[PDB]
Amino acid sequence: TQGLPRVIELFEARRPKAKAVISEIDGVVRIEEGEDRLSVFVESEGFSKEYKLPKDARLLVKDGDYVEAGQPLTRGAIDPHQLLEAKGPEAVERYLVDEIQKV
């Protein structure tokens, strides 16, 4: 379990260990990975940004599924500043509080 150390990891908004990645904006998902690395693109209509990921990490996103901004890609705690700039001020509080209470 996470516990007290995690409590600190939240209250201090310190960069997570397993830091998950999120789509910086709403874009379709495209899972394209040959055997080299694990690349999951997230491309909107006129905004295209891909995401480099290790082949090991377990992704939670389905291919082609339209995802929103700040929406999680990999399993793990989400970086506070990152998610802040991503989903906006509202959700920040949500994730933080919910996790603290989680533990």
Side-chain angles (χ1 to χ4, degrees):
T1 319
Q2 282 296 315
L4 168 129
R6 167 117 178 98
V7 182
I8 315 182
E9 203 170 13
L10 286 136
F11 277 82
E12 209 53 78
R14 277 170 185 175
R15 316 127 301 270
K17 37 178 184 301
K19 173 190 69 178
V21 313
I22 50 90
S23 308
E24 295 173 68
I25 206 183
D26 355 284
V28 310
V29 164
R30 214 176 58 77
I31 312 175
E32 195 197 278
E33 14 81 281
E35 183 52 60
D36 46 336
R37 49 180 50 181
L38 208 77
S39 303
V40 171
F41 288 58
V42 189
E43 317 126 300
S44 194
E45 35 108 3
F47 325 114
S48 166
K49 213 299 171 183
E50 93 124 307
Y51 293 91
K52 292 292 182 50
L53 336 166
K55 277 184 50 73
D56 45 281
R58 35 209 286 87
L59 68 159
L60 36 97
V61 285
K62 300 191 181 299
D63 187 69
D65 286 29
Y66 202 64
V67 304
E68 294 180 358
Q71 199 174 318
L73 295 165
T74 83
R75 188 175 292 184
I78 306 285
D79 190 295
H81 302 56
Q82 196 159 70
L83 64 85
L84 165 76
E85 305 196 11
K87 212 169 173 189
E90 242 285 10
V92 173
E93 314 153 348
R94 310 209 176 271
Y95 176 82
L96 293 159
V97 179
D98 197 51
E99 284 286 307
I100 301 165
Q101 265 277 61
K102 200 175 191 173
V103 174

mmCIF file of all heavy atoms in Angstrom, residues 51-95:
data_model
loop_
_atom_site.group_PDB
_atom_site.id
_atom_site.type_symbol
_atom_site.label_atom_id
_atom_site.label_comp_id
_atom_site.label_asym_id
_atom_site.label_seq_id
_atom_site.Cartn_x
_atom_site.Cartn_y
_atom_site.Cartn_z
ATOM 1 N N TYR A 51 3.180 9.912 -27.802
ATOM 2 C CA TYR A 51 3.771 9.696 -26.480
ATOM 3 C C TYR A 51 4.674 8.465 -26.453
ATOM 4 O O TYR A 51 4.219 7.342 -26.673
ATOM 5 C CB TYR A 51 2.668 9.570 -25.423
ATOM 6 C CG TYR A 51 1.901 10.858 -25.224
ATOM 7 C CD1 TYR A 51 0.756 11.118 -25.964
ATOM 8 C CD2 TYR A 51 2.329 11.823 -24.322
ATOM 9 C CE1 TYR A 51 0.052 12.291 -25.807
ATOM 10 C CE2 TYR A 51 1.627 13.007 -24.156
ATOM 11 C CZ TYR A 51 0.489 13.232 -24.903
ATOM 12 O OH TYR A 51 -0.224 14.399 -24.756
ATOM 13 N N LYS A 52 5.959 8.691 -26.194
ATOM 14 C CA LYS A 52 6.937 7.613 -26.071
ATOM 15 C C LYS A 52 6.786 6.909 -24.723
ATOM 16 O O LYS A 52 6.809 7.553 -23.674
ATOM 17 C CB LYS A 52 8.358 8.157 -26.248
ATOM 18 C CG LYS A 52 8.669 8.650 -27.663
ATOM 19 C CD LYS A 52 8.703 7.497 -28.656
ATOM 20 C CE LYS A 52 9.069 7.959 -30.062
ATOM 21 N NZ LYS A 52 10.294 8.804 -30.103
ATOM 22 N N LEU A 53 6.648 5.587 -24.756
ATOM 23 C CA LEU A 53 6.436 4.797 -23.543
ATOM 24 C C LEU A 53 7.227 3.490 -23.580
ATOM 25 O O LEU A 53 7.495 2.954 -24.654
ATOM 26 C CB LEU A 53 4.946 4.479 -23.351
ATOM 27 C CG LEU A 53 3.842 5.345 -23.971
ATOM 28 C CD1 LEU A 53 2.516 4.605 -23.920
ATOM 29 C CD2 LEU A 53 3.719 6.689 -23.272
ATOM 30 N N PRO A 54 7.622 2.975 -22.405
ATOM 31 C CA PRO A 54 8.299 1.676 -22.375
ATOM 32 C C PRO A 54 7.316 0.533 -22.642
ATOM 33 O O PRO A 54 6.148 0.636 -22.271
ATOM 34 C CB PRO A 54 8.862 1.619 -20.952
ATOM 35 C CG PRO A 54 7.871 2.411 -20.158
ATOM 36 C CD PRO A 54 7.552 3.579 -21.060
ATOM 37 N N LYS A 55 7.780 -0.519 -23.311
ATOM 38 C CA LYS A 55 6.936 -1.664 -23.660
ATOM 39 C C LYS A 55 6.380 -2.427 -22.463
ATOM 40 O O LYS A 55 5.368 -3.120 -22.579
ATOM 41 C CB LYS A 55 7.716 -2.642 -24.537
ATOM 42 C CG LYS A 55 7.734 -2.298 -26.010
ATOM 43 C CD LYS A 55 8.449 -3.386 -26.782
ATOM 44 C CE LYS A 55 7.898 -4.761 -26.425
ATOM 45 N NZ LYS A 55 6.545 -4.995 -27.000
ATOM 46 N N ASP A 56 7.049 -2.309 -21.323
ATOM 47 C CA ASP A 56 6.652 -3.041 -20.124
ATOM 48 C C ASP A 56 5.401 -2.454 -19.489
ATOM 49 O O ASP A 56 4.437 -3.175 -19.227
ATOM 50 C CB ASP A 56 7.784 -3.065 -19.096
ATOM 51 C CG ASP A 56 8.435 -1.714 -18.919
ATOM 52 O OD1 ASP A 56 9.265 -1.335 -19.772
ATOM 53 O OD2 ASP A 56 8.096 -1.020 -17.937
ATOM 54 N N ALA A 57 5.435 -1.145 -19.242
ATOM 55 C CA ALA A 57 4.354 -0.445 -18.555
ATOM 56 C C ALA A 57 2.990 -0.801 -19.123
ATOM 57 O O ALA A 57 2.793 -0.832 -20.338
ATOM 58 C CB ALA A 57 4.572 1.055 -18.631
ATOM 59 N N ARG A 58 2.046 -1.058 -18.227
ATOM 60 C CA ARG A 58 0.718 -1.478 -18.633
ATOM 61 C C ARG A 58 -0.164 -0.268 -18.914
ATOM 62 O O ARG A 58 -0.536 0.469 -18.001
ATOM 63 C CB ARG A 58 0.101 -2.355 -17.544
ATOM 64 C CG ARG A 58 0.496 -1.926 -16.131
ATOM 65 C CD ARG A 58 0.525 -3.080 -15.123
ATOM 66 N NE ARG A 58 -0.807 -3.536 -14.729
ATOM 67 C CZ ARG A 58 -1.526 -4.445 -15.382
ATOM 68 N NH1 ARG A 58 -1.043 -5.044 -16.462
ATOM 69 N NH2 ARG A 58 -2.728 -4.777 -14.934
ATOM 70 N N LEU A 59 -0.474 -0.070 -20.192
ATOM 71 C CA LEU A 59 -1.333 1.027 -20.619
ATOM 72 C C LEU A 59 -2.795 0.720 -20.329
ATOM 73 O O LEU A 59 -3.217 -0.431 -20.425
ATOM 74 C CB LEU A 59 -1.111 1.306 -22.116
ATOM 75 C CG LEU A 59 -1.569 0.261 -23.139
ATOM 76 C CD1 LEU A 59 -1.751 0.911 -24.498
ATOM 77 C CD2 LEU A 59 -0.582 -0.911 -23.232
ATOM 78 N N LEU A 60 -3.576 1.749 -20.014
ATOM 79 C CA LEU A 60 -4.995 1.538 -19.765
ATOM 80 C C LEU A 60 -5.894 2.035 -20.907
ATOM 81 O O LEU A 60 -7.100 1.782 -20.900
ATOM 82 C CB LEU A 60 -5.408 2.195 -18.439
ATOM 83 C CG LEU A 60 -4.760 3.518 -18.008
ATOM 84 C CD1 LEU A 60 -5.627 4.703 -18.386
ATOM 85 C CD2 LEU A 60 -4.461 3.519 -16.514
ATOM 86 N N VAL A 61 -5.317 2.724 -21.890
ATOM 87 C CA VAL A 61 -6.107 3.269 -23.001
ATOM 88 C C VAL A 61 -6.306 2.311 -24.173
ATOM 89 O O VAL A 61 -5.389 1.587 -24.568
ATOM 90 C CB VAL A 61 -5.485 4.568 -23.551
ATOM 91 C CG1 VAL A 61 -5.762 5.717 -22.601
ATOM 92 C CG2 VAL A 61 -3.992 4.396 -23.802
ATOM 93 N N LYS A 62 -7.517 2.310 -24.721
ATOM 94 C CA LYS A 62 -7.830 1.500 -25.891
ATOM 95 C C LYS A 62 -7.500 2.255 -27.182
ATOM 96 O O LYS A 62 -7.534 3.484 -27.206
ATOM 97 C CB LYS A 62 -9.307 1.100 -25.877
ATOM 98 C CG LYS A 62 -9.721 0.280 -24.671
ATOM 99 C CD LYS A 62 -11.117 -0.300 -24.855
ATOM 100 C CE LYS A 62 -11.553 -1.106 -23.640
ATOM 101 N NZ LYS A 62 -10.669 -2.270 -23.369
ATOM 102 N N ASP A 63 -7.183 1.526 -28.252
ATOM 103 C CA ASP A 63 -6.883 2.151 -29.540
ATOM 104 C C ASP A 63 -8.076 2.902 -30.126
ATOM 105 O O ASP A 63 -9.207 2.425 -30.069
ATOM 106 C CB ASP A 63 -6.400 1.121 -30.562
ATOM 107 C CG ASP A 63 -5.930 1.770 -31.856
ATOM 108 O OD1 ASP A 63 -4.880 2.445 -31.836
ATOM 109 O OD2 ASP A 63 -6.613 1.613 -32.891
ATOM 110 N N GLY A 64 -7.813 4.071 -30.698
ATOM 111 C CA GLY A 64 -8.834 4.837 -31.391
ATOM 112 C C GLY A 64 -9.907 5.437 -30.510
ATOM 113 O O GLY A 64 -10.757 6.186 -30.988
ATOM 114 N N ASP A 65 -9.868 5.122 -29.222
ATOM 115 C CA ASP A 65 -10.861 5.649 -28.305
ATOM 116 C C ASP A 65 -10.624 7.136 -28.109
ATOM 117 O O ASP A 65 -9.525 7.550 -27.745
ATOM 118 C CB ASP A 65 -10.809 4.907 -26.968
ATOM 119 C CG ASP A 65 -11.389 3.510 -27.055
ATOM 120 O OD1 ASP A 65 -11.335 2.907 -28.146
ATOM 121 O OD2 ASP A 65 -11.885 3.005 -26.025
ATOM 122 N N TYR A 66 -11.647 7.941 -28.372
ATOM 123 C CA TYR A 66 -11.522 9.374 -28.175
ATOM 124 C C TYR A 66 -11.359 9.627 -26.682
ATOM 125 O O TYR A 66 -12.234 9.291 -25.885
ATOM 126 C CB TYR A 66 -12.739 10.109 -28.749
ATOM 127 C CG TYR A 66 -12.504 11.571 -29.067
ATOM 128 C CD1 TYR A 66 -11.594 11.956 -30.046
ATOM 129 C CD2 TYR A 66 -13.213 12.566 -28.407
ATOM 130 C CE1 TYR A 66 -11.383 13.295 -30.343
ATOM 131 C CE2 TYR A 66 -13.011 13.902 -28.696
ATOM 132 C CZ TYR A 66 -12.096 14.262 -29.664
ATOM 133 O OH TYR A 66 -11.901 15.594 -29.946
ATOM 134 N N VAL A 67 -10.230 10.219 -26.312
ATOM 135 C CA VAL A 67 -9.950 10.529 -24.918
ATOM 136 C C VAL A 67 -9.970 12.032 -24.696
ATOM 137 O O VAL A 67 -9.857 12.812 -25.642
ATOM 138 C CB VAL A 67 -8.599 9.943 -24.461
ATOM 139 C CG1 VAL A 67 -8.568 8.446 -24.699
ATOM 140 C CG2 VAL A 67 -7.441 10.643 -25.159
ATOM 141 N N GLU A 68 -10.110 12.429 -23.437
ATOM 142 C CA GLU A 68 -10.200 13.834 -23.077
ATOM 143 C C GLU A 68 -8.851 14.374 -22.621
ATOM 144 O O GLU A 68 -7.856 13.653 -22.606
ATOM 145 C CB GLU A 68 -11.249 14.020 -21.980
ATOM 146 C CG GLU A 68 -12.667 13.702 -22.442
ATOM 147 C CD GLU A 68 -13.696 13.885 -21.345
ATOM 148 O OE1 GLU A 68 -13.297 14.218 -20.209
ATOM 149 O OE2 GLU A 68 -14.899 13.684 -21.616
ATOM 150 N N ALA A 69 -8.809 15.659 -22.291
ATOM 151 C CA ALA A 69 -7.574 16.279 -21.829
ATOM 152 C C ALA A 69 -7.314 15.919 -20.374
ATOM 153 O O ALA A 69 -8.211 16.015 -19.540
ATOM 154 C CB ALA A 69 -7.639 17.789 -22.004
ATOM 155 N N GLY A 70 -6.094 15.485 -20.074
ATOM 156 C CA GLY A 70 -5.746 15.104 -18.718
ATOM 157 C C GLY A 70 -6.060 13.652 -18.417
ATOM 158 O O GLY A 70 -5.690 13.129 -17.366
ATOM 159 N N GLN A 71 -6.754 13.002 -19.348
ATOM 160 C CA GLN A 71 -7.135 11.598 -19.208
ATOM 161 C C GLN A 71 -5.904 10.696 -19.119
ATOM 162 O O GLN A 71 -4.976 10.822 -19.915
ATOM 163 C CB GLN A 71 -8.042 11.179 -20.375
ATOM 164 C CG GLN A 71 -8.863 9.917 -20.118
ATOM 165 C CD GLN A 71 -9.851 9.607 -21.230
ATOM 166 O OE1 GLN A 71 -10.514 10.502 -21.753
ATOM 167 N NE2 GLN A 71 -9.964 8.330 -21.585
ATOM 168 N N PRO A 72 -5.900 9.771 -18.148
ATOM 169 C CA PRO A 72 -4.764 8.877 -17.901
ATOM 170 C C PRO A 72 -4.462 7.897 -19.034
ATOM 171 O O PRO A 72 -5.356 7.467 -19.758
ATOM 172 C CB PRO A 72 -5.195 8.129 -16.636
ATOM 173 C CG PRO A 72 -6.677 8.107 -16.732
ATOM 174 C CD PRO A 72 -7.007 9.491 -17.214
ATOM 175 N N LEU A 73 -3.175 7.606 -19.198
ATOM 176 C CA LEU A 73 -2.681 6.656 -20.189
ATOM 177 C C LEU A 73 -2.124 5.383 -19.531
ATOM 178 O O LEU A 73 -2.454 4.270 -19.945
ATOM 179 C CB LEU A 73 -1.630 7.316 -21.083
ATOM 180 C CG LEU A 73 -2.169 8.453 -21.965
ATOM 181 C CD1 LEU A 73 -1.051 9.295 -22.556
ATOM 182 C CD2 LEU A 73 -3.037 7.890 -23.072
ATOM 183 N N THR A 74 -1.270 5.545 -18.521
ATOM 184 C CA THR A 74 -0.656 4.397 -17.842
ATOM 185 C C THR A 74 -1.050 4.316 -16.364
ATOM 186 O O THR A 74 -1.384 5.327 -15.745
ATOM 187 C CB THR A 74 0.890 4.447 -17.912
ATOM 188 O OG1 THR A 74 1.392 5.290 -16.864
ATOM 189 C CG2 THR A 74 1.367 4.970 -19.260
ATOM 190 N N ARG A 75 -1.022 3.104 -15.811
ATOM 191 C CA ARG A 75 -1.404 2.878 -14.420
ATOM 192 C C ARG A 75 -0.374 3.449 -13.451
ATOM 193 O O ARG A 75 0.813 3.130 -13.530
ATOM 194 C CB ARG A 75 -1.596 1.377 -14.147
ATOM 195 C CG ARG A 75 -2.181 1.054 -12.773
ATOM 196 C CD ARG A 75 -2.468 -0.439 -12.601
ATOM 197 N NE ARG A 75 -3.552 -0.907 -13.463
ATOM 198 C CZ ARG A 75 -4.048 -2.141 -13.440
ATOM 199 N NH1 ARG A 75 -3.559 -3.044 -12.599
ATOM 200 N NH2 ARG A 75 -5.032 -2.478 -14.264
ATOM 201 N N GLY A 76 -0.844 4.272 -12.521
ATOM 202 C CA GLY A 76 0.018 4.872 -11.519
ATOM 203 C C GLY A 76 -0.464 6.243 -11.087
ATOM 204 O O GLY A 76 -1.420 6.779 -11.649
ATOM 205 N N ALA A 77 0.176 6.789 -10.058
ATOM 206 C CA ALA A 77 -0.103 8.148 -9.603
ATOM 207 C C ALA A 77 0.185 9.171 -10.699
ATOM 208 O O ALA A 77 1.152 9.028 -11.446
ATOM 209 C CB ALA A 77 0.708 8.462 -8.357
ATOM 210 N N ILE A 78 -0.644 10.207 -10.785
ATOM 211 C CA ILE A 78 -0.474 11.235 -11.807
ATOM 212 C C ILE A 78 0.296 12.445 -11.259
ATOM 213 O O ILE A 78 0.004 12.915 -10.161
ATOM 214 C CB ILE A 78 -1.837 11.712 -12.357
ATOM 215 C CG1 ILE A 78 -2.675 10.533 -12.858
ATOM 216 C CG2 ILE A 78 -1.642 12.776 -13.432
ATOM 217 C CD1 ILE A 78 -2.218 9.970 -14.174
ATOM 218 N N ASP A 79 1.287 12.927 -12.011
ATOM 219 C CA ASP A 79 2.067 14.107 -11.617
ATOM 220 C C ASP A 79 1.160 15.328 -11.432
ATOM 221 O O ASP A 79 0.396 15.675 -12.332
ATOM 222 C CB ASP A 79 3.153 14.405 -12.658
ATOM 223 C CG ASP A 79 4.147 15.458 -12.190
ATOM 224 O OD1 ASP A 79 3.742 16.622 -11.986
ATOM 225 O OD2 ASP A 79 5.343 15.127 -12.053
ATOM 226 N N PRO A 80 1.258 15.994 -10.268
ATOM 227 C CA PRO A 80 0.340 17.065 -9.856
ATOM 228 C C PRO A 80 0.320 18.296 -10.770
ATOM 229 O O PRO A 80 -0.757 18.742 -11.177
ATOM 230 C CB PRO A 80 0.875 17.449 -8.472
ATOM 231 C CG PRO A 80 1.518 16.199 -7.978
ATOM 232 C CD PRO A 80 2.217 15.673 -9.197
ATOM 233 N N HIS A 81 1.493 18.843 -11.073
ATOM 234 C CA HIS A 81 1.595 20.015 -11.938
ATOM 235 C C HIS A 81 1.091 19.685 -13.343
ATOM 236 O O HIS A 81 0.352 20.460 -13.965
ATOM 237 C CB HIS A 81 3.041 20.522 -11.997
ATOM 238 C CG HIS A 81 3.621 20.873 -10.661
ATOM 239 N ND1 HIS A 81 3.665 19.984 -9.607
ATOM 240 C CD2 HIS A 81 4.183 22.019 -10.207
ATOM 241 C CE1 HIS A 81 4.232 20.566 -8.566
ATOM 242 N NE2 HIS A 81 4.554 21.801 -8.902
ATOM 243 N N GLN A 82 1.518 18.524 -13.828
ATOM 244 C CA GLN A 82 1.125 17.999 -15.132
ATOM 245 C C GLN A 82 -0.395 17.962 -15.269
ATOM 246 O O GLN A 82 -0.960 18.603 -16.157
ATOM 247 C CB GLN A 82 1.734 16.610 -15.349
ATOM 248 C CG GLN A 82 1.723 16.136 -16.793
ATOM 249 C CD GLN A 82 2.755 15.052 -17.051
ATOM 250 O OE1 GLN A 82 2.617 13.920 -16.588
ATOM 251 N NE2 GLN A 82 3.805 15.401 -17.787
ATOM 252 N N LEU A 83 -1.047 17.201 -14.393
ATOM 253 C CA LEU A 83 -2.503 17.080 -14.413
ATOM 254 C C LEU A 83 -3.164 18.446 -14.235
ATOM 255 O O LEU A 83 -4.237 18.697 -14.795
ATOM 256 C CB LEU A 83 -2.980 16.102 -13.327
ATOM 257 C CG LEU A 83 -2.760 16.396 -11.835
ATOM 258 C CD1 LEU A 83 -3.856 17.283 -11.256
ATOM 259 C CD2 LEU A 83 -2.651 15.113 -11.026
ATOM 260 N N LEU A 84 -2.527 19.314 -13.450
ATOM 261 C CA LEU A 84 -3.014 20.681 -13.265
ATOM 262 C C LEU A 84 -3.165 21.409 -14.585
ATOM 263 O O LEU A 84 -4.247 21.884 -14.930
ATOM 264 C CB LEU A 84 -2.080 21.485 -12.359
ATOM 265 C CG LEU A 84 -2.300 23.004 -12.390
ATOM 266 C CD1 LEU A 84 -3.524 23.442 -11.598
ATOM 267 C CD2 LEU A 84 -1.056 23.746 -11.925
ATOM 268 N N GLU A 85 -2.063 21.487 -15.321
ATOM 269 C CA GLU A 85 -2.063 22.166 -16.608
ATOM 270 C C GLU A 85 -2.908 21.415 -17.631
ATOM 271 O O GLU A 85 -3.385 21.998 -18.603
ATOM 272 C CB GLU A 85 -0.631 22.344 -17.107
ATOM 273 C CG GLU A 85 0.249 23.073 -16.101
ATOM 274 C CD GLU A 85 1.534 23.599 -16.702
ATOM 275 O OE1 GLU A 85 1.660 23.589 -17.944
ATOM 276 O OE2 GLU A 85 2.415 24.033 -15.929
ATOM 277 N N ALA A 86 -3.102 20.123 -17.398
ATOM 278 C CA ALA A 86 -3.820 19.288 -18.349
ATOM 279 C C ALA A 86 -5.337 19.445 -18.243
ATOM 280 O O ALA A 86 -5.961 20.055 -19.111
ATOM 281 C CB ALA A 86 -3.438 17.837 -18.155
ATOM 282 N N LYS A 87 -5.930 18.910 -17.176
ATOM 283 C CA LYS A 87 -7.388 18.937 -17.029
ATOM 284 C C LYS A 87 -7.948 20.275 -16.538
ATOM 285 O O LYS A 87 -9.109 20.595 -16.800
ATOM 286 C CB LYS A 87 -7.858 17.799 -16.111
ATOM 287 C CG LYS A 87 -9.240 17.263 -16.503
ATOM 288 C CD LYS A 87 -9.606 15.978 -15.770
ATOM 289 C CE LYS A 87 -11.047 15.559 -16.049
ATOM 290 N NZ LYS A 87 -11.488 14.424 -15.186
ATOM 291 N N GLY A 88 -7.132 21.055 -15.834
ATOM 292 C CA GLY A 88 -7.593 22.317 -15.278
ATOM 293 C C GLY A 88 -7.675 22.290 -13.762
ATOM 294 O O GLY A 88 -7.493 21.237 -13.153
ATOM 295 N N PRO A 89 -7.947 23.449 -13.142
ATOM 296 C CA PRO A 89 -7.903 23.615 -11.683
ATOM 297 C C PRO A 89 -8.889 22.741 -10.905
ATOM 298 O O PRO A 89 -8.534 22.257 -9.832
ATOM 299 C CB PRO A 89 -8.241 25.098 -11.506
ATOM 300 C CG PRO A 89 -9.118 25.399 -12.678
ATOM 301 C CD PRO A 89 -8.449 24.666 -13.806
ATOM 302 N N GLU A 90 -10.106 22.579 -11.416
ATOM 303 C CA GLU A 90 -11.123 21.751 -10.769
ATOM 304 C C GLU A 90 -10.623 20.348 -10.409
ATOM 305 O O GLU A 90 -10.510 19.999 -9.234
ATOM 306 C CB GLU A 90 -12.366 21.643 -11.654
ATOM 307 C CG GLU A 90 -13.634 22.222 -11.031
ATOM 308 C CD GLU A 90 -14.234 21.343 -9.943
ATOM 309 O OE1 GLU A 90 -13.582 20.368 -9.509
ATOM 310 O OE2 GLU A 90 -15.371 21.632 -9.518
ATOM 311 N N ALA A 91 -10.333 19.557 -11.438
ATOM 312 C CA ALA A 91 -9.896 18.164 -11.297
ATOM 313 C C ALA A 91 -8.702 17.956 -10.368
ATOM 314 O O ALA A 91 -8.572 16.899 -9.750
ATOM 315 C CB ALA A 91 -9.574 17.596 -12.662
ATOM 316 N N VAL A 92 -7.812 18.943 -10.319
ATOM 317 C CA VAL A 92 -6.626 18.908 -9.467
ATOM 318 C C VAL A 92 -7.019 18.501 -8.052
ATOM 319 O O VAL A 92 -6.607 17.448 -7.531
ATOM 320 C CB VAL A 92 -5.944 20.284 -9.429
ATOM 321 C CG1 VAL A 92 -4.810 20.299 -8.426
ATOM 322 C CG2 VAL A 92 -5.411 20.614 -10.783
ATOM 323 N N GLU A 93 -7.823 19.373 -7.451
ATOM 324 C CA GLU A 93 -8.367 19.190 -6.116
ATOM 325 C C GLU A 93 -8.977 17.800 -5.952
ATOM 326 O O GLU A 93 -8.676 17.099 -4.990
ATOM 327 C CB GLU A 93 -9.409 20.273 -5.833
ATOM 328 C CG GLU A 93 -8.963 21.677 -6.227
ATOM 329 C CD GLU A 93 -10.124 22.592 -6.571
ATOM 330 O OE1 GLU A 93 -11.255 22.087 -6.729
ATOM 331 O OE2 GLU A 93 -9.911 23.819 -6.671
ATOM 332 N N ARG A 94 -9.818 17.417 -6.913
ATOM 333 C CA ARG A 94 -10.450 16.098 -6.962
ATOM 334 C C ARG A 94 -9.444 14.970 -6.765
ATOM 335 O O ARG A 94 -9.546 14.213 -5.799
ATOM 336 C CB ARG A 94 -11.180 15.897 -8.297
ATOM 337 C CG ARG A 94 -12.119 17.016 -8.714
ATOM 338 C CD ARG A 94 -13.264 16.469 -9.560
ATOM 339 N NE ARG A 94 -14.236 17.504 -9.887
ATOM 340 C CZ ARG A 94 -15.280 17.787 -9.116
ATOM 341 N NH1 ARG A 94 -15.464 17.104 -7.998
ATOM 342 N NH2 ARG A 94 -16.133 18.743 -9.454
ATOM 343 N N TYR A 95 -8.488 14.851 -7.687
ATOM 344 C CA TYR A 95 -7.504 13.769 -7.615
ATOM 345 C C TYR A 95 -6.802 13.810 -6.262
ATOM 346 O O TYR A 95 -6.790 12.809 -5.543
ATOM 347 C CB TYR A 95 -6.471 13.829 -8.751
ATOM 348 C CG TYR A 95 -5.393 12.757 -8.620
ATOM 349 C CD1 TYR A 95 -5.623 11.460 -9.070
ATOM 350 C CD2 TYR A 95 -4.160 13.033 -8.036
ATOM 351 C CE1 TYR A 95 -4.656 10.470 -8.946
ATOM 352 C CE2 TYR A 95 -3.187 12.048 -7.908
ATOM 353 C CZ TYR A 95 -3.442 10.769 -8.366
ATOM 354 O OH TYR A 95 -2.483 9.790 -8.242
#
